[PDB]
């Protein structure tokens, strides 16, 4: 019983070691496409007032 | 953009209140009264200057 449950644990911390590190990934490169594009939206703005 | 519209603002009325004193009616309805005043005032001397002449 104690070698089974100690399966499933290491199971289960694979899992979770697999996961964390592709999610980071992720929110890395979403950030980063975010940012690049509030900064389009900050130059077509300061353009626009200046017409205005 | 709150920095920017309140600027603009700054900037129109600075315009308005040097160009006031030729610009505004209530400068100018002050300079029409003071020249009625004197128009009506002349059509009385040229109206009695056979009265004046003789005096």
């Known amino acids: ?52 | 953009a709150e920095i920017n519209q309140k600027s603009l603002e700054l900037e129109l009325l600075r315009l308005e209140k040097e160009t006031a004193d030729i610009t505004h009616p209530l400068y100018l309805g002050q300079k029409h009264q003071a020249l009625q005043a004197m128009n009506s005032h002349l059509e009385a001397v040229l109206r009695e200057k056979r009265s004046l002449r003789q005096r």
């Open chain 1, 1 to 52: 019983m104690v070698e089974m449950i100690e399966s499933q644990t290491l199971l289960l911390t694979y899992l979770t070691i697999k996961m964390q590190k592709n999610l980071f990934r992720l929110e890395e490169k979403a950030e980063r496409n975010l940012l690049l594009v509030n900064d389009q939206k900050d130059q077509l703005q300061e353009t626009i007032h200046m017409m205005k």
